[PDB]
C-alpha cells in the first residue's frame, strides 16, 4: 500500500461523487478560476481563497447587528453592478439606507427591491427573480424575518410547530439548482440576536445549503484618541466548499463610509512587509506615512499615487491574472 496514492484516489472519488471541494487539505494552494464577486474587502477576498464570493452559490453572512454584514452585502452588490450586473434586494426588515448604499458605490436606481408579505412570498419572489437568469446577485435581508404566513396571520396551536425551518429548507432545496444554472449569488443576511442561546430558524437549513458561511463580528471601535468614526470587523470563513475554510480577515468600516481601502492597504502592507511598522510610526520605502494608523490612513488617502503602488505590490504578491 502507498498511502498518498491511495488517498488521492479516495479524494478523487469523494469529489466526483459529491462535488469539487467535498474534501481538501487546509494547506491547499487552490488553482480554479471560479467567477467571484469581490467582497469589498481585499483581506476577506484572500481569506475566501477565490478572491471574493463564489457566483451561483448560497452565501450566509451571520453575526450580531452592527458587525459589518450589510456593508459587505452592499459592497458586493456595488461590485456586481459595476461589472454590468443586475441586483435584487429582498427586504423583510425595512432597514436598508439607500443613501449609505450609494456611498458604497451601489446604483440604487437600478436596484430591485421587494418587501414581501410573508416569509413564503419572500423566498418565492427571490426564486422567481433568480431563475430568470437576469441577476448576478440577490441579497435577502434577515433570515429570521422570513416568518411563516401562518404565524404572521394569527394561528395559535398553543405550540404550533417548527415550520419556518422547513420553509427555509424546501425553499433552498429548489433555489440552489436555479442559482447554479443562473450563476446568481444568493447572500442571506443572518442577524443573530437576544444575548445568548450560527442559526436563526432557517439558518439551520442554510448551514448545509451554503457554499460559503461568514461569521461577521465587531471586535474594535476605531479611534484616534477618543475620536471614533467607525469600528473594526473580524470575519471568519467557517464554511468554504470552494477553498480551504477556517481562514480569517479584518477591516475597518468608518462611520458613514464602507470598508476602508487604505486601512486594508496598511494592514496587509505591514503583515506582508511592504510597509514597515516601526512602533508608533509607519513607513513605505523611506517615505513617512505618519504616526498612527489614522494618519497613515489619511496619508494614503491624500497620496493616491502611493497606496496604488502599494496595492499593486500586495496584489501581485497574492492574486494576479490566473489561468
Ligand X SMILES: Nc1ncnc2c1ncn2[C@@H]1O[C@H](COP(=O)(O)OP(=O)(O)O)[C@@H](O)[C@H]1O
| 100 annotated as belonging to a binding site for a ligand | yes
Phi-psi region of 215 (alpha: psi -120 to 50; beta: other; left: phi over 0): beta
Q: Which is nearer to ligand X, 69 or 313 (CB)?
A: 69
- Position 40 contacts ligand X (CB under 6 A): no
Q: Which residues 6+ apart lie within 8 Å of 144 measured at CB? A: 190, 191, 193, 200, 201, 202, 203
- Position 70 contacts ligand X (CB under 6 A): yes
Shortest reach from residue 264's CB to ligand X, in Å: 15
Site string for ligand X, 154-193 (x = CB under 6 A): -------------------------------------x--
Helix (H, G, I), strand (E, B) or coil at 201: coil
| 304 annotated as belonging to a binding site for a ligand | no
- Position 41 contacts ligand X (CB under 6 A): no
Residues 254-273 that bind ligand X (CB under 6 A): 255-256
Structure-block grid coordinates of residue 318: 497574492
Q: Which residues 6+ apart lie within 8 Å of 115 measured at CB? A: 91, 92, 94
Identify the residue among 8, 97, 271, 285 touching ligand X (CB under 6 A): 97
The one segment of 58-66, 76-84, 111-119, 143-151 that binds ligand X by CB under 6 A = 58-66
Residues 212 and 60 sit within 8 Å (Cβ to Cβ): yes
The one segment of 106-114, 202-210, 249-257, 315-323 that binds ligand X by CB under 6 A = 249-257
- Position 8 contacts ligand X (CB under 6 A): no
| 260 annotated as belonging to a binding site for a ligand | no
Distance CA(300)–CA(307), nearest Å, equals: 6
Q: Which is nearer to ligand X, 59 or 178 (CB)?
A: 59
- Position 220 contacts ligand X (CB under 6 A): no
- Position 100 contacts ligand X (CB under 6 A): yes
Site string for ligand X, 106-145 (x = CB under 6 A): ----------------------------------------
- Position 230 contacts ligand X (CB under 6 A): yes
| 66 annotated as belonging to a binding site for a ligand | yes
The one segment of 9-17, 60-68, 166-174, 315-323 that binds ligand X by CB under 6 A = 60-68
What kind and span of H or E run contains 237? strand 232-240
| 68 annotated as belonging to a binding site for a ligand | yes
Q: Going edge to edge, which strands form the sheet with 281-284?
A: 276-278, 281-284, 287-291
Identify the residue among 8, 28, 65, 287 touching ligand X (CB under 6 A): 65
Helices (H), the chain: 3-18, 42-47, 69-82, 98-103, 119-130, 149-152, 163-182, 203-209, 261-271, 293-302, 305-317
Shortest reach from residue 32's CB to ligand X, in Å: 29
- Position 253 contacts ligand X (CB under 6 A): yes
Distance CA(40)–CA(1), nearest Å, equals: 47
**β-strand 212-220 against 58-64: which pairing, if any?**
parallel
- Longest CA pairwise span in the chain (Å): 72
- Torsion, Cα 166 93 235 316, to 10 degrees, reads 110
The residues binding ligand X (CB under 6 A) are 63, 65-71, 97, 100, 191, 216, 230-231, 253, 255-256
Give the residue numbers of the binding site for phosphate.
66-70, 191
Give the residue numbers of the binding site for ATP.
66-71, 97-100
Amino acid at each position: 500500500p502507498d498511502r498518498e496514492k491511495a488517498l488521492e484516489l479516495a479524494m478523487a472519488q469523494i469529489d466526483k461523487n459529491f462535488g469539487k471541494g467535498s474534501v481538501m487539505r487546509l494547506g491547499e494552494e487552490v488553482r480554479q478560476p471560479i467567477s467571484v464577486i469581490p467582497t469589498g474587502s481585499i483581506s476577506l477576498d484572500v481569506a475566501l481563497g477565490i478572491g471574493g464570493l463564489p457566483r451561483g452559490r448560497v452565501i450566509e453572512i451571520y453575526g450580531p447587528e452592527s458587525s459589518g454584514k450589510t456593508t459587505v452585502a452592499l459592497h458586493a452588490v456595488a461590485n456586481a453592478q459595476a461589472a454590468g450586473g443586475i441586483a435584487a434586494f429582498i427586504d423583510a426588515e425595512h432597514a436598508l439606507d439607500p443613501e449609505y448604499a450609494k456611498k458604497l458605490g451601489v446604483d440604487t436606481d437600478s436596484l430591485l427591491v421587494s418587501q414581501p408579505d410573508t416569509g413564503e412570498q419572500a423566498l418565492e419572489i427571490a426564486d422567481m427573480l433568480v431563475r430568470s437568469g437576469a441577476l448576478d446577485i440577490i441579497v435577502i435581508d434577515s433570515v429570521a424575518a422570513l416568518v411563516p404566513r401562518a404565524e404572521i396571520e394569527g394561528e395559535m396551536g398553543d405550540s404550533h410547530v417548527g415550520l419556518q425551518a422547513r420553509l427555509m429548507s424546501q425553499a433552498l432545496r429548489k433555489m440552489t439548482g436555479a442559482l447554479n444554472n443562473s450563476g446568481t449569488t444568493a447572500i442571506f443576511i443572518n442577524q443573530l440576536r437576544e444575548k445568548i442561546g450560527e442559526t436563526t430558524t432557517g439558518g439551520k437549513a442554510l448551514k448545509f445549503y451554503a457554499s460559503v458561511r461568514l461569521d461577521v463580528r465587531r471586535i474594535e471601535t476605531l479611534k484616534d484618541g477618543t475620536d471614533a468614526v467607525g469600528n473594526r470587523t473580524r470575519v471568519k470563513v467557517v464554511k468554504n466548499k470552494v477553498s480551504p475554510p477556517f481562514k480569517q480577515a479584518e477591516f475597518d468600516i468608518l462611520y458613514g463610509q464602507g470598508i476602508s481601502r487604505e486601512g486594508s492597504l496598511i494592514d496587509m502592507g505591514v503583515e506582508h512587509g511592504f510597509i514597515r511598522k516601526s512602533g508608533s510610526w509607519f513607513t513605505y520605502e523611506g517615505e513617512q506615512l505618519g504616526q498612527g494608523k489614522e494618519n497613515a490612513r489619511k496619508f494614503l488617502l491624500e497620496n493616491t499615487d502611493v497606496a496604488n503602488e502599494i496595492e499593486k505590490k500586495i496584489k501581485e504578491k497574492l492574486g494576479i491574472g490566473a489561468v
